[PDB]
Each structure stands twice: as C-alpha cells, then as structure tokens.
Design a binder for this molecule. Structure first.
Ligand SMILES: *[C@@H]1O[C@H](CO)[C@@H](O[C@@H]2O[C@H](CO)[C@@H](O[C@@H]3O[C@H](CO[C@H]4O[C@H](CO)[C@@H](O)[C@H](O)[C@@H]4O)[C@@H](O)[C@H](O[C@H]4O[C@H](CO)[C@@H](O)[C@H](O)[C@@H]4O)[C@@H]3O)[C@H](O)[C@H]2NC(C)=O)[C@H](O)[C@H]1NC(C)=O
Ligand SMILES: *[C@@H]1O[C@H](CO)[C@@H](O[C@@H]2O[C@H](CO)[C@@H](O)[C@H](O)[C@H]2NC(C)=O)[C@H](O)[C@H]1NC(C)=O
Ligand SMILES: *[C@@H]1O[C@H](CO)[C@@H](O[C@@H]2O[C@H](CO)[C@@H](O)[C@H](O)[C@H]2NC(C)=O)[C@H](O)[C@H]1NC(C)=O
Ligand SMILES: *[C@@H]1O[C@H](CO)[C@@H](O[C@@H]2O[C@H](CO)[C@@H](O)[C@H](O)[C@H]2NC(C)=O)[C@H](O)[C@H]1NC(C)=O
Ligand SMILES: *[C@@H]1O[C@H](CO)[C@@H](O[C@@H]2O[C@H](CO)[C@@H](O)[C@H](O)[C@H]2NC(C)=O)[C@H](O)[C@H]1NC(C)=O
Ligand SMILES: *[C@@H]1O[C@H](CO)[C@@H](O[C@@H]2O[C@H](CO)[C@@H](O)[C@H](O)[C@H]2NC(C)=O)[C@H](O)[C@H]1NC(C)=O
Ligand SMILES: *[C@@H]1O[C@H](CO)[C@@H](O[C@@H]2O[C@H](CO)[C@@H](O)[C@H](O)[C@H]2NC(C)=O)[C@H](O)[C@H]1NC(C)=O
Ligand SMILES: *[C@@H]1O[C@H](CO)[C@@H](O[C@@H]2O[C@H](CO)[C@@H](O)[C@H](O)[C@H]2NC(C)=O)[C@H](O)[C@H]1NC(C)=O
Ligand SMILES: *[C@@H]1O[C@H](CO)[C@@H](O[C@@H]2O[C@H](CO)[C@@H](O)[C@H](O)[C@H]2NC(C)=O)[C@H](O)[C@H]1NC(C)=O
Ligand code: NAG
Ligand code: NAG
Ligand code: NAG
Ligand code: NAG
Ligand code: NAG
Lengths: 440, 120, 123, 439, 122, 443
C-alpha cells in the first residue's frame, strides 16, 4: 500500500575523484595570479550527526597537489635563460683567501671562455662555485649537469617563497573536513564539517623536518599507513613549534654577464669579509622536550618497556640524507645528526647544524631538468617553525627491546599529505527515492 | 537555515524540508573549464531523468509505481524519522536500477493514456 | 527491447512507443580540447531542443498534443497511411519544407495561451 | 479534423560532419590519450532501413588523416635534434663482406661531431645507406641538410600500430553497412548502429595494403569512377597473401653523447656477410590472388579483354616502391616481381629486393624530417596483404587491352579501406505529425 | 514585427507580448576563447532555468505565484507601472528588493509542494 | 491586493564585461582563417525611446582588441626563421654610388661572415642596411644585439589589414550609438542593437589615423578630459585627406641559406639612383582640413584664442614621427610640414603639395615591448601605396594660465587610442531576461 516518491535535493554523497581548482587571496612560481580570487568569508557547515570515514593515504587530493606544483614550477622556467654555454671546461683553483677549516675545499675560483652577445666574440669570466656543483674531468672541471641535463637559470625576478593556495571543489562536489582532535588519518571521524575550499596551504618544500605547517591540536600525533611495517614512513605532527634560525654568513657580491642577444648570467663575483660555513640553530631545551613528547607517543605503539633510539640517516643522495630547504632563494642542505642522536629509556644553549649550499638543483627526483639558482646578493637569514618530522624505522629486530628511528624522507607527497589529511572530496548525489503514502 | 549539507545526518523527515538548500548549490587553465563542463553535465543528467519520469518541475514528486517489500521491508515509522538519508541510500542501493526502470515505464504508459483520452 | 535506433524503419505508430530509448541516449594537448568540444556540442544541442519544447508549451513530455490544426497543404495523407504505412524517416523527408511554418505556429499558440491563463486567474 | 502533435525521441537522423574522438584497449600513437573502450560494444541491427553510403566523400577519413599526422608529430617533440650532424662527411665504400647485390649500398663515413662540453669535439664514424647521403661536389652531406632539420625518433617509443576506435559524441551515431560485396557507394539494404568503430590499425604502406580487413566472399573492386583514369582502384582481397620480410644483416648499434642530455644512435658495424633486405611472396598464392582480381576487373572492363599488369611508371621512391615499417625499420621494396603479367581470356617464391633508409620524410611534407635509429640484431616481420592499390593507364580507346600498375602514396586511400562501411549521422529527435488529439 | 530587444523602451504592458523574442536568442588563442564563451552562455541559461524550476515556473514565460506584493518594495498604481514605465526603469526601481522577492518565491513553492504531497496521500 | 508575477524574456540589460570572439568575411598575420565566417546580411535592430550612456574611455572592447592583435602578431612569427647567426660584427662602409643629397649616410654597405647549411662552412655576405638598424661598436652591429633575438617575418604572410568583426556570445548584445556629433562619454538618444560590430581594419599608425571611419557631418573632437593637458585628443574628420607614399628606389632582393632549411633575405643592391622615401598630401586639402579642425577646437578653447600647431618633439621615433606599414615596408615620415601654423579668428580657408620626407627601418620593435624584435624582409621592386587620413591624434602644451595661445602637437605611441576611434560607438551589455512585477494574477 506504499508508493515510490522521488526526492531531489537529498543531502547524500559518495566518495569521488574529481578535478580541483586553485584559488588564492587578492613574481612567484605558483601562478597565484592565475588562481581564482578567494572568498573573504568562507563558510563551514557543521554536520551534527555525521560520522565519516577518512583515509589520508588514499587521498587523491595529494596527487593533484603534487602534479599542480610540478607543473607550475616548470611553467615558471619557460621564459628564462638557457645556460647551455656554461658547459665548458672550467679551470679551477681553491679559494684560500679566508679559511676557518670548515670551508676548506667548499669554494672554488673557476675561469672560462663564455660567449658574448656577438657570435664572433668571446669573453673571459671568473666566478665562484660551491664545490658540489663542480666535478673533475680527468685543475680541469665541468658542471655536474653536463652529462644529464640542459641547465636553465631561474629568473631573478621570480620568488620561490611559498604563498598559501586553496583547493576548491567544483559545483556538485564538496570537501568534507575532519575536526576530530587527535585524528590519526585512517578511520571514522565523529566530527566533520563541509567546506567548499581548503585552508590556505603553503607549498613548502623540505625533507626530514617539515617547516611552517599546522600544529597538533593537543598532543603529538603519530601517523602511518602501517606502524608494524617498517617500510612505511611515519609522519609526526608536533604540538608546539620548534624555532630554527638559519643563515648564510657571507656577504656575496653578485655580478652579471651578457651571454647572448637577450640573455644574461648571474654569478658570485667575490666575497666581502671572511668566509664562514652556513648553519642552523635549534635550542637544546626545546628540542629535548620535543623528542620527549615524540618518544612518549611512540611507546603507545611500540611498548612501555621499549627503548626508543634515534639515529642519523643511513645514507643516500644529499637531497635525502640532509634537511633540504630554501631561504632567501638559496638552497640549503643541513646536517641533522645533531638532532637525532640519543637513546630514551623508560637555557640559551643551542644545537648547531652545519649546512652545505648548491646552485644546481634537480627537483622532484627527476632526471634531465636541472635548474641553476642565481646567487643572492648580500647576507641571508631566515627563521622558520618545525611543525613535524618524518621518521623511518629499522626493521628485522624481532627479538630486541630497542627500536631505532631515523630522519628519512625525500618523497614530496608526504609533505603535501601532512596538510591534506583532514580533507576528502565527495560527490553530491541529490536524487533518490523512498516509500510514502502519496500516489499520483 | 543549517547550511548546504546541514541536514545530512538529520532524519529523513527533517531533511526533506530543506531540499532547496542543496538544489541551489548544484550548478554553482583548462582544468577549471573541464570542471565547469562536468558540473553542467551532471546537472543535466539528473534533470533529464526527472523529465523522463514526469517529475521535471518538482523537488518532491509522487508517482504511480508501488513499493515492493523485497526492496525494503520496513515500517514507515522506522524509515521516516528514525533513519537518515545516507543510511537509506546505502540500504537500497542494490535496487535503484530496478526502481528507475519502473518509473520510466510508468510514465510511458501514462502519456499514451493521456493522449487517448484527449482524442476521445 | 530493440536498441537506440532499433525502431527506425518500423512504422510511425510502432516507433512512437519506444521514445524513451532515444531520449536516454541524448547526452549519453588539443585532444583534451577535442573532447571538450564534443561535450559542449552535445549539451548545446540538447538544450536547444529543450528550449523549443519549453516555448511551445510541452516542456518535460515525450508526447505533446497542442492547439495548432493540421494543414492539408503540409500533408494530405490519411491517418492510417501516415501511422501504419510510413516510417519516421519517410515522414520527416515529406514534410521537411514545412518545418519552420509549423514551429512558428506552435510558438504563437503558446503565447496566446499563457496570456489567457493570466487573465483568467486574475478574474 | 487533425491537430499537430509534437513527439520527442523520434528515431530519425540526417547526415552530419562532426568531430569524433578516439578510444583504445611507449608508442607514437599516444593511446594513453584515448578513452578506454567498452569490452562488449553494442550493435543494433536496423530492420527495414536502407541507407545511402559514399566512401569517397567521408569526413571520417579526413579526421583520421589529421589525427595520425598530429600524433606522429607530437611523439617527436621531446626527442633529440640532430642539427649537429650537418657537417661534411668523409665517406668510402664498404667492401669487406659485400655480395654483388650490395655493392654501393653502404658507405663508411667519418666526421667531427660535438661533445657535452661545447669546447671539445670527437671523431665519429658510422655506416650509412647510400640513399641517405648525397655527394657535395669523398665529401658527402646528409640528404636533408638543404631542405629540413632532423629529429631523431626516440629509441624507446614504438611505431607498431595499435587499433584505434573512433567514437561519436552523444547526439550522434555511426551507421555501419553490413552488406557483403558492397562497393563503397549507393544504397546499403543491411545496416546497423554502433557508437564506436571496430579497431583500426593505422598501418602505413604505399602499394599493398597490409593487415586490414578481408572481403567476406569475393574480391571487391572499389573506385570513385572506374572509367576515370585519374582515380585509384582499391582492391579488397577475400584471402590474405602472406608476405615474409627481413633485414638479414646483424647490426651493432652504438651511441654517442652529442650534448648535455642528448645522444645519437647509429650503426657501428655489421657482423657477418652483408646481404640485401628482401620480402618473400609465395608463387601459387600470388598467382591465384591475381587471377581473382582479373576476373572482377573483367566484369568492369569486358568479358573478353586483355588485362596487363606492369610496374610503376616512375616517380619518387615512396610511390615507385612498396614502403612499410618492419620491426621499426623503413623498407622500400620493388614490386615488379608481383606486377609483371598479361592475362588473356609447390613452395616456389617471388623475392622482392628491398632498400632501406634512415632519413624519412613522411605524409608528403617538406621541412620535417625524421631520423630512424638503427635496430640492433636481425629484423624479421610477417604480415598479410589484404588489399592492393592500382592505377589504370589511359588506353588508346581502340584496343582491347588495359594496363594496371601499382598506385598509391596518398594516405587517405589507405584509411578509406577500413572506413568505407561507416557513416556519421546526427540524431534529430524532435518532430511533428498529425493526430486526432487536441490540447 | 520587432527583433531582439526591439521592445526595449516600450512600456511594460507592451513589451510583455515579445517574451519569446528575447527567449529564442538566449543560448543562440581562439580555440579556448570561443569554447569558454560557449560554456558561459550555457551556464547563464541554466541558472535562470533553475530558478524558474525552484519557483514552480519551469514551463512558463508568464508565471503567477502566491506571494503578495509589498508596498514597501514599490508603491505604485498598476496603471503607472504597466502603461507608464519601461522594463529598464522598473528594474532600476525594484533592484534593491529583488533578493527579498526571489527568496520568498522559493519558500512559497516549497511549502506548496509539501501541501500537495499531503493532499495526495489522503 | 497585488501578487508577484514572474516574467521571462524581459528586454532589459546590465553593463557587462565578457569575452568577445572574431568573425570574418570568408594568408595573414591576423590568422583570419581561424575566425567565424560572418553573416553576409546581419540584422541591426533600432531601439525606439532608449537612451543609454556610453563611455569610450572605459570600454573593455578596446583592451580585448589590443590583446588579440598582439597575440596574433606573435603567433605569426612562431614558424619563422630566428636570425641569431646574424648578430655579428659587420664591416660597413658608406654607399656613395648614385646618391642624392638627402641620402647621405642613410645606407651602409656591410660585409660579414654568415653560417650556412653545413656547420663546417662559412660564407661571406654583402648586404645593404639602413642606418637606423645598425650601430657603431668600420665595425658595426645590429641595433637589437644587446636587447633581443630577432625573428625574420615569413615572406608568405601578409601584413595588410583585413576587417575583423567582433561578436558577442549568446546572452550578450552589443549596443551601438547612432548619434551624429557624438563625442563619447555621454547619453546617446539614438541607439540600436547588433550582434557583431562593423568590420574594423587593424591599421597600425602613430600620429595620423589612416583608413578609418569618417564623421558624417562635422569634425569631432574627443578626449577623456579636455582641460587636462596630459590627455590625448582624437580628431575624427568628415572628409578623407588623401596621402600618396612611395619608396622610389628599385631594390634587388637576394637570399642565402643560413642553416638546414632556413634562409635570410636581404637587399642586394639598388638598380637606379638612390632617392629619399616620401609622402605627399595636397596643400589645399590639408589647409581646409586644418581650418575645419580649428573651428571645432574653438568650442573648448574659445573666446578668440590663438590656435597654434607645432611639430612633435621628443627622442622616441615612433612618437615623433608618423609610423606606418606601406606594402609591407616600414616608414617613419616627418610631419613637421603638416603641423606648423598659427590660426586667429581673422584668417580662413591648385595642384601644389606638401612633401614629407620619410625614413625606413627593417628592425621593428612593436607594441612598445622590449625583448622582441622583428626583421622585415626587403621587398623587390618599387613601393607605392595610397591611403586615406581619417583622423588625428593631438596633444596640448601645458603651463599656460597666463596666455591666450594654445599649442597643439601630434601625439601617439599608445595603440589603444587607435582602436578607440572605431570602437567608441559600441558597448557590451548582458541580457537579464528574468524579472518580477505586481499584477492582479494569483496562482
Ligand atoms: C589603406 O587602404 C589602401 C586600399 O586598400 C591600401 O592600399 C593597397 O595596399 C595593398 C597591399 O600593399 C595593395 O595590394 C598589392 O598590389 C600590388 C600591385 O598590383 C597591381 O597590379 C595588379 C595586376 O598585375 C592589379 O590586379 C592590382 O589591383 C594592382 O593594380 C600586388 O603586386 C601585390 O601582390 C603581391 O604581394 C602580396 C602580399 O602583399 C602577395 O600575396 C601576392 O601574391 C603578390 O606577390 C598586392 O596585391 C593594393 O594595390 C593597394 N591599393 C591601392 C589603391 O593602392 C593601403 O595600404 C592602406 N593603408 C594602410 C596604412 O594600411
Ligand atoms: C588509527 O586509529 C584507528 C582507530 O580509529 C586504528 O584502526 C584499527 O586498527 C586495528 C588493527 O589493524 C583493527 O583491528 C581495528 O578494527 C581498526 N579500527 C577501526 C575503527 O577501523 C588504526 O590502526 C590507527 N592507525 C595509526 C597509525 O595509529
Ligand atoms: C601491516 O604490516 C604487517 C607487517 O609486515 C603485515 O603483516 C604480515 O603479513 C605477511 C603476509 O603478507 C605475513 O607473512 C607476516 O608474518 C605478517 N607480519 C606480522 C608481524 O604479523 C600486515 O598484513 C600489514 N597490514 C595490512 C593491512 O596490509
Ligand atoms: C542530532 O541527533 C540528536 C539526537 O541524538 C537530535 O536531538 C533531538 O532533537 C529533537 C528535535 O525535534 C528533540 O525533540 C530531542 O529531544 C533531541 N534529543 C535529545 C537527546 O536532546 C539533534 O536535533 C540532531 N541534530 C540535527 C542537526 O539533526
Ligand atoms: C520489418 O518489416 C516486416 C515486414 O512488414 C515487419 O514484419 C511484420 O510485423 C507485423 C506486426 O508484428 C506482422 O503482423 C507481419 O506478419 C510481419 N510480416 C512478416 C512478413 O513477417 C517487421 O516487424 C519490421 N521490423 C521492424 C523493426 O519494424
Ligand atoms: C557501385 O554500385 C552502384 C549500384 O549499386 C553503381 O551505381 C550506378 O552507376 C551507373 C553508372 O554511372 C548509374 O547509371 C546508376 O544510376 C548508378 N546506381 C545507383 C544506385 O547509384 C556504382 O557505379 C558502382 N561503383 C563501382 C566502383 O563499382
Ligand atoms: C566518370 O568518368 C567519365 C570518364 O570515363 C566521365 O565522362 C566524361 O565527362 C567529360 C566532361 O567532364 C566529357 O567531356 C567526356 O567526353 C566524358 N567521357 C566519356 C567517355 O563519355 C563522367 O562524367 C564521370 N562521372 C561523373 C559523375 O563525373
Ligand atoms: C516613444 O514614446 C512616445 C510617447 O510620447 C510615442 O509617441 C506616441 O506613440 C503612441 C503610440 O505608441 C501614439 O498613440 C501617440 O500619439 C504618440 N505621441 C504621444 C504624444 O504620445 C512614440 O511613438 C514612442 N516611440 C516608439 C516606441 O516608437
Ligand atoms: C560630450 O558630451 C557630454 C554630454 O553633453 C558632455 O558631458 C558634460 O560634461 C560637463 C563637464 O564635465 C558636465 O558638467 C555635464 O554635466 C555633462 N553633461 C551630461 C549630460 O552628462 C561632455 O563634456 C562632452 N565631451 C567633450 C570633450 O566635449
Ligand atoms: C683544494 O681542495 C682539495 C679538497 O677538495 C684539497 O685536497 C687540496 O689540497 C686543496 N688545495 C689547496 C691549494 O688548498
Ligand atoms: C662506390 O660505389 C659507387 C656506386 O654507388 C661506384 O660507382 C664507385 O666506383 C665505388 N667506389 C669504390 C672505390 O669502390
Ligand atoms: C538601494 O540600496 C543602495 C545601497 O544600499 C542605497 O544606497 C539606496 O538608497 C537604496 N535605495 C534606492 C531606492 O536606491
Ligand atoms: C658617411 O656619411 C656620414 C653622413 O654624411 C658622414 O658623417 C661619415 O663620415 C661618412 N663616412 C664615410 C666612411 O664616408
Ligand atoms: C580682425 O579684422 C577686423 C576687421 O578688419 C579688425 O578690425 C581687427 O582688428 C582684426 N583683428 C586682429 C587681431 O588683427
């Protein structure tokens, strides 16, 4: 005695994979002018009796963020100088004017025959290089990219400083956000809300230590696809930030050479003052409190009678074993063995991390597309917040009481996924039926 | 008020009173263009289907197809006001391609009958 | 059963009973653009036909009777000849010339009807 | 008495030209860019529908042509340019292992080519086919240096055809002609509706049509106009003829870095005796096949006439020989062994000599040339001849002898051999008819 | 016989007889330029159709509802609206109260659909 | 008493900015083959009793035309030869062979070592260049060598303007102002609706506007703010002034291959004597034209002022000289002979004429951009073109608070101001078909 009644505008949905678009607040490498201007007053709708299941490791928003960043990165280099004329034999000697023995062998004084704006003329050039960019070819050296990639100069007018971007769902779709404090990313979320756009996310690029992200609501959160499987990385979200102060303690004079009709090359000409090693400062007390919190949360998964030991990375590319980041436009590779060297068993004194600098950069783990980072004029300093760690675990210890964690990393999707863990995209399915007593 | 999906999680009886809330938020470099086209296509598929069933202008449409207890054997009092639309949608997802087929058949028979009555 | 154009070749009478089959099939690098152009074109054609049905007073109906009388000058065939001994393809060719005349008349009739409804409701 | 009644969803259509898109099951056909197909496509038989087809006026062919060319060019965009190779070459004859058939075919060329570092050069030598190298006045240059630039094809991207399905946009449909013995034009009493075509392999060849569809019962002679000497004849066979092609020489392939991230591939040497490339066609099969062709030609040209086959009259290598891509290598085979017979009312074979080229112009364009990297080892491929392209000599009009020669070179004619049974129509669902029904 | 917008400038009571003239023309480097323009025309068309749908006017050019007119939106005699104003002038006067009238229209139709459902159930 | 009634198809609109597309009358730098073919008989609808406000100085249609032209221009150079092998030291001497007195130092005979089909070979090339393209470093270099790569324009692609029609997308319409003596920036009592504009030829010029529309009755003076001397004044004439331009030297064009399928074109030699390029206008027509212009300027600068015309002055050649394309060649004509007079209320106005000397360049930097350059191949033979002057761009000297004399000079250099002279009568509006009004009808 019941009849089918059709209802349209029914508040239901399904998991879905769709295209998201970029929005930004009203140069850079994020085409932020190409992104849709944002809503000054975004809405968020709390769903009072909705429990939803989230899985951050299957979140396709991460894959899109990854592809958008790489694409935008490459687009920003399209119009820049192609420094193919630099792949020549370089004649290099050591910079010995000011040695502290930290920098011995870190800078070389190279000279070469560079092209000029006229096809029939050459010029002799003298420039300084940071060692890691230069390899011997037998005093005769070549740049490291000569046997794999054409090198493109980044445009000096375009900044690499992250600008928050927002991902927005298209009409017919919505983004559900998990508001459950202390949510580990995989499972039911008792408290959710609907938004159309994500919070602004800064595409900060780093390894090991994740800078300038979101903090845990109350306590350190240990997130992993599988804790038992040591092949997975562990993303640790910190409750409080750890301040890190990084510097390039040298006054560099930058020169510019015309190398073709509409092209010029930027390089370090000389150094004013003494020559010193780049470094980062982390307070010992803050860092010691930070690890104590991490250790406590790891014991909840590994045992209260389990010893937690930290150790330095076992090896790999410099891009993996060090803390890579970009400050002032310069690319730093800092050694974190000073942060992860202790065993944990149930005031103005800092930790100094020495750093290396590179000008030839190979991002996103690709081969064949090298970038040359122009030197930045003057003396460089930045201050940033460590808001999370990436740790890996040593396996095979089936009969031990001590677990070892190391500062691994290098896969950029892990950083993206550390902000896009509370969001999922759903398709709205407004049409449906139910029995009623109403008959046409 | 509540908001765009504010009635999600509310029982069906309450949620059915906010249908314009969700309806008004549907349909509202080339990645964006592709997305705009999809929004239109999805909107139109639902409207096309309501048209075929004879529900083209309605948010709530009563048809002539009887309910089969094999789809769901429940009291109305435990469907309406004791269940949400998300729960209901999962319970009968198996049967929606049957129900839709019946709705289409019903409208075709109805239109032919209307034509004959006008002719008489 | 049949299929999307399966009733083609059947007579008009028989073919009129399969209208939802076709109704369901409508709407269902530079080579990303090629796909968008194909999608947009399908949408625009769908909407132009829907716009006419709206204007003529049919809207969401498959079979729509109206108030425009049939002219013997468009066709002087008997109904049994039209519905039982012809297919829709043959019919469409036969009265192709008169399509725009008929469409204009369908539109005028609906405009008159909407105004009349408005006046009667005001009374 | 009667009123106008409007019907929507009417099964009626009109001829149309619209854009079709591809669908499919690295590779130069970029099949990852196509929509995945339906594993079980539908086909609807249309009882009592007669429709008119014309394969000689078919926009589907024009689109396939444009897509094939565009895919081809796209696949070369990221590949190494070989402009560093327009240098003077110092070439001598290869004689050490040459059989008589190969005298003069290979040259041993030395040259100065760049290195990763722009301030150094390296001396390189390689073997080239005679057809790729032109004498300057021992001083030679590559044949393309005065007309085009060379792009090396990427060594890891296959040329092997992958079936492409063409699909209509919603609102459109593709009608298929099911008639057996259909000659490409006029009414087709048995038709069906599909949304996507069968998969078509974009096989590129110049005189014989390889790996296509066979006729169901008899050889079919198709032409826009039989008595027009300006038109080609497409002959569809009802049986395949198997052809076995080889490049018997064992090549050793070497590579050189020519710039940062760039390398050139070339033949370093040949190990073993140097012999000519060739194709084998069985005598008996070919004689039966050709006999079937003349029977059908007599239906068009007279019951008691003389049909003579002859070799191509002349022109560019691409039209005087049968060209194909075998194993990724480019062959130019002489078909005079197949078309040298006058027809008047065991395990033997025909060997067709073949030449090979590495510098390839294609689609009859100028300015865009490709270098085909050599392939290491020995090449063998087996394929089926499913059709022929023939051209008829104008006759004297007062003598009962006709002469046919291999024709071809216009790629659209190869496409037409598969896309002859398909037509694209627009669906016109809205229409009116009288009935006794008033609003 | 007037063309598109030919009635603009005529009074409201005259212009209302040309509603199909302006209805027929709605929906009727360069690759993208042109494609975006086509998509946009469709999106605008559909937004207007969606509102007519919600308000219960989906099949009509002229649609009468059950929402009373407020003198606070505009206090005018019908004779000085329909015979002495053009639609452009009218729009400029009622623009500030449109998002009030449109909101009521949606609410009224939603209540009407619920009432119909209950009556049919009886 | 009254009820809300909803109407759809209401003839109203709002100002709006949307994307316009081109249409054309079915090879060139405008890629016109890519435009939508036009309707041979488009319909214009007159709107009785509609007054609308137009503002030509705030009209996006101008900005879109500007962007489309630049984009198309650049696209036309994408498949063309990049003359980077050409940026070399040149060994140049003066051409003194059969030169007249004005042509002294104008042409230089330059010898250089050019690349060829093979990388191992070089060829010696002797070509003639104009003095404006070459700068001293006998050693000279091309002017673009310290700012940009230069692209040779393809000889097969025409630079002759083809009328382009701008068309609104469905849902939008273009209103046209039919008023005569309409200066923009005002109410327009007589308007009509069109879907597409008239064809507009994208003619590029500086000081004098060539081949545009004429005023129907009187010369019209238009400016954003007439009392602001920083603004330009556009003048639309009601009669054309004919101008005859020529490049009298008979050029022999030679070409060489400079690479694998690439070639460079250059002037090899001059067959007859070497003369200066020039343009003629008649004196009587030009003198009457100015009288008509002065008469209208007096409506804004009245009470018997002195209206003085003077030559343009500044360093930039595009700004101070009349720049235009004549048959594919690029001319820079000196207009001081046209703008050197003083008018008072007591003065007024056979086969005599005014000759304007012209300079020619092959290296062109268009649209005021830096970093791009085009090399214009020489044209074989002798060039002659006849054009119509349909308007002027003028500026006014400031600093006068204490004087009764106003001075006007030729201006130019901002291409949007040329576009504005054709698009001033058009406005784009969005159609808003849905609306409500009270009636006595209740559902
Ligand atoms: C303002 O408006 C005027 C009028 O439209 C423009 O003047 C015209 O400019 C065009 C382009 O330069 C001229 O067209 C060219 O004419 C040459 C001479 O041809 C004469 O002789 C032939 C017979 O042999 C007659 O049919 C013809 O009508 C002429 O009497 C041709 O040789 C040119 O063709 C060559 O160049 C083109 C590329 O430009 C190639 O495509 C051709 O294949 C060929 O190689 C060309 O046709 C036209 O004659 C001019 N008209 C007048 C009256 O002078 C002004 O230029 C314009 N002003 C501005 C600033 O834009
Ligand atoms: C995150 O929290 C969820 C609980 O919400 C954990 O999921 C449980 O995992 C165990 C072991 O696989 C299963 O037996 C339970 O059935 C799961 N519960 C639910 C509700 O799904 C998950 O393991 C936690 N992950 C991390 C890294 O802490
Ligand atoms: C999480 O990781 C553990 C550790 O590898 C997985 O458990 C193992 O499963 C394999 C079979 O694939 C067995 O042979 C091992 O003996 C198991 N190891 C332990 C310690 O139990 C577990 O399956 C993973 N969970 C998921 C969901 O994949
Ligand atoms: C979420 O669920 C709770 C019940 O768990 C709802 O609370 C009830 O709301 C009705 C409204 O008619 C009241 O009569 C009941 O007394 C409330 N129950 C209790 C225990 O207080 C709540 O309204 C739901 N929220 C939403 C948005 O639907
Ligand atoms: C194709 O034409 C045939 C011949 O008219 C149709 O078959 C007839 O169908 C009617 C109705 O069922 C029967 O009464 C006749 O006896 C049938 N004739 C024969 C010779 O069998 C057939 O239905 C048509 N096909 C379609 C799809 O309309
Ligand atoms: C294919 O077959 C059709 C007939 O089915 C042939 O068309 C006829 O050609 C003659 C000669 O020009 C005309 O007089 C007839 O009127 C045509 N009939 C029809 C139905 O079109 C066509 O010539 C044949 N083509 C080939 C290559 O064999
Ligand atoms: C098919 O080809 C024949 C040629 O065999 C065409 O007939 C010729 O037409 C021209 C005019 O264009 C006449 O001058 C010739 O005298 C005709 N030749 C003969 C032998 O009669 C015929 O027109 C072509 N068919 C079509 C449709 O174009
Ligand atoms: C513009 O408005 C004026 C109103 O004065 C119209 O002039 C009147 O038009 C009506 C017909 O619509 C005549 O009956 C009157 O005699 C005319 N004059 C007066 C004094 O009203 C004029 O026709 C309108 N223009 C249009 C829309 O064509
Ligand atoms: C073009 O015509 C308009 C309309 O007559 C002139 O606009 C007037 O400008 C003055 C000075 O700014 C204002 O005080 C008036 O109120 C404006 N009138 C109207 C109706 O808006 C405009 O100045 C003229 N332009 C030129 C250069 O003469
Ligand atoms: C230059 O640096 C290398 C280490 O990279 C060191 O072995 C060598 O002795 C140094 N030369 C001088 C002169 O200091
Ligand atoms: C090389 O081959 C050519 C034929 O291509 C022949 O004419 C020439 O004599 C041969 N030269 C030598 C040295 O064998
Ligand atoms: C309409 O709203 C605007 C903006 O709030 C206000 O300035 C104006 O006075 C209002 N009323 C009218 C009749 O314009
Ligand atoms: C070339 O002509 C210019 C202009 O008259 C003169 O200044 C210059 O000295 C001349 N140079 C030579 C080499 O004659
Ligand atoms: C203009 O002419 C009149 C009449 O001849 C004369 O009176 C007046 O002074 C003249 N004005 C000037 C400025 O010369």
């Amino acid at each position: 005695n019941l009849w089918v009644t059709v209802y349209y505008g029914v508040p239901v949905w399904k998991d879905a994979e769709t295209t998201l678009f970029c929005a930004s607040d009203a140069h850079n490498v994020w085409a932020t002018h190409a992104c849709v201007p944002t809503d000054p007053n975004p809405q968020e709708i709390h769903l009072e009796n909705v429990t939803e299941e989230f899985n951050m490791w299957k979140n396709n928003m991460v894959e899109q963020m990854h592809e958008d960043i790489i694409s935008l990165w490459d687009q920003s280099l399209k119009p820049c100088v192609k420094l193919t004329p630099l792949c020549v034999t370089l004649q290099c000697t050591n910079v010995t004017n000011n040695i502290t023995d930290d920098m011995r062998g870190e800078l070389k004084n190279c000279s070469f025959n560079m092209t000029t704006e006229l096809r029939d003329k050459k010029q002799k050039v003298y420039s300084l290089f940071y060692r890691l960019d230069v390899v011997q070819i037998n005093k005769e050296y070549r740049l490291i990219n000569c046997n794999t990639s054409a090198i493109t100069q980044a445009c000096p007018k375009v900044s690499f400083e992250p600008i928050p971007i927002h991902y927005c769902a298209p009409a017919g779709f919505a983004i559900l956000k998990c508001k459950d404090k202390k949510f580990n990313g995989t499972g039911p979320c008792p408290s959710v809300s609907t938004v159309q756009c994500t919070h602004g996310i800064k595409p900060v690029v780093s390894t090991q230590l994740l800078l300038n992200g979101s903090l845990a609501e109350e306590e350190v959160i240990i997130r992993s696809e599988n804790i038992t499987n040591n092949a997975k990385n562990i993303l640790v979200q910190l409750n409080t930030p750890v301040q890190i102060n990084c510097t390039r303690p040298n006054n560099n004079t930058v020169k510019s050479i015309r190398i073709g009709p509409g092209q010029a090359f930027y390089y370090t000409g000389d150094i004013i003052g003494d020559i010193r090693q780049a470094h980062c400062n982390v307070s010992k007390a803050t860092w010691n409190e930070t690890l104590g919190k991490v250790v406590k949360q790891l014991r909840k998964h590994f045992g209260n009678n389990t010893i937690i030991r930290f150790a330095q990375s076992s090896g790999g590319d410099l891009e993996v074993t060090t803390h890579s980041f970009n400050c002032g436009g310069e690319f730093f590779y800092c050694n974190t063995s000073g942060l992860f060297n202790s065993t944990w068993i149930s005031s103005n004194d800092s930790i100094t991390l020495p750093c290396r600098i590179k000008q030839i950069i190979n991002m996103w783990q690709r081969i064949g597309q090298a970038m040359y980072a122009p030197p930045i004029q003057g003396v460089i300093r930045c201050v940033s917040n460590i808001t999370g760690l990436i740790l890996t675990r040593d396996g095979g210890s089936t009969n031990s009481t001590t677990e070892t964690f190391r500062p691994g990393g290098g896969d950029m999707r892990d950083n993206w996924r550390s902000e896009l863990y509370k969001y999922k995209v759903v398709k709205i399915e407004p049409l449906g039926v139910a029995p009623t007593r109403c008959k046409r | 008020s509540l908001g765009f999906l504010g009635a999600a999680g509310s029982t069906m009886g309450a949620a059915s009173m906010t249908l314009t809330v969700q309806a008004r938020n549907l349909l509202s470099g080339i990645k964006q263009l592709q997305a705009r086209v999809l929004a239109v296509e999805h909107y139109l598929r639902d409207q096309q289907l309501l048209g075929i069933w004879g529900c083209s202008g309605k948010l709530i449409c009563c048809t002539n197809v009887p309910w089969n207890s094999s789809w769901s054997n429940r009291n109305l009092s435990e469907i309406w006001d004791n269940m949400t639309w998300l729960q209901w949608d999962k319970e009968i997802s198996n049967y929606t391609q049957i129900i839709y087929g019946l709705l289409e058949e019903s409208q075709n028979q109805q239109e032919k009958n209307e034509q004959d009555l006008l002719a008489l």
